[PDB]
Design a protein around this ligand. Structure first.
Ligand SMILES: [Zn+2]
Ligand SMILES: [Zn+2]
Length: 229
């Protein structure tokens, strides 16, 4: 189900949902895939995460023009690392409203990234305060606690069985938790579990660096994270 468009890959996950994938050479780990989402909600399109770069992110927008041909209303990005926010400039230049966790926006500049235009804030129970996520449509945003990074957020898609863990969640056969440079090692396992608990109906777990997996990905990630304490 993998449709190729330039150097990116687009896979349809549900009637109105596609996964976007872009690649970055990291001498040392090969050409590393990073995944986000594209969601059509009526007459507009919503994006979760940029690609690694502005040029790749512009190509996402070109694919949207070709295959969907509706305006992109907004993007939400799930933490301040290059794989998730490297293409913010391309979104802004295209006039697309952007949203991120407030903490992501605070950290973005010192990370060499462009902050989103708008900040999300979260209730005590982890769910986004809805007034900070206007026009999010079926996107349901949850802060599970610090894990892969202190600012990591997660997104469910109402009307589907899909939940997106971003870089918090690794697949059920992953050998490690990947980049732990900015991780909260004490809290990671609990945060991974909290993501699962927030989206109990989700059977397709989408994540940054592997194809979509079952809920076992969540359990496996949390077991690996337990080893960090
Ligand atoms: Zn990251
Ligand atoms: Zn990542």
């Amino acid at each position: 189900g993998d449709q190729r468009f330039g150097d990116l890959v687009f896979r349809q996950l549900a009637p109105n949902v596609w996964q976007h994938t872009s690649y970055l050479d990291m001498p040392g780990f090969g050409a590393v895939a990073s995944n986000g989402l594209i969601v059509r909600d009526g007459g507009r399109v919503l994006v979760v995460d940029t690609a690694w770069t502005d040029d790749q992110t512009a190509q996402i927008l070109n694919w949207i023009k070709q295959e969907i041909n509706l305006p992109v209303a907004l993007a939400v990005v799930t933490h301040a690392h290059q794989d998730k926010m490297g293409g913010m400039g391309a979104l802004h230049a295209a006039g697309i409203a952007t949203y991120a966790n407030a903490l992501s926006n605070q950290l973005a500049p010192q990370e060499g990234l462009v902050a989103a235009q708008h900040s999300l804030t979260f209730a005590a129970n982890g769910w986004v305060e809805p007034a900070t996520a206007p026009n999010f449509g079926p996107l349901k945003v949850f802060y599970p606690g610090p894990g892969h990074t202190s600012d990591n957020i997660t997104v469910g898609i109402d009307g589907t069985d899909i939940a997106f863990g971003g870089c918090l969640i690794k697949d059920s056969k992953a050998k490690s938790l990947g980049n732990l440079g900015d991780a909260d090692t004490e809290h990671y396992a609990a945060s991974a579990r909290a993501f699962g608990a927030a989206f109990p109906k989700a059977s397709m777990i989408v994540m940054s660096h592997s194809a979509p997996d079952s809920r076992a990905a969540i359990t496996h990630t949390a077991r690996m994270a337990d080893k960090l304490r």
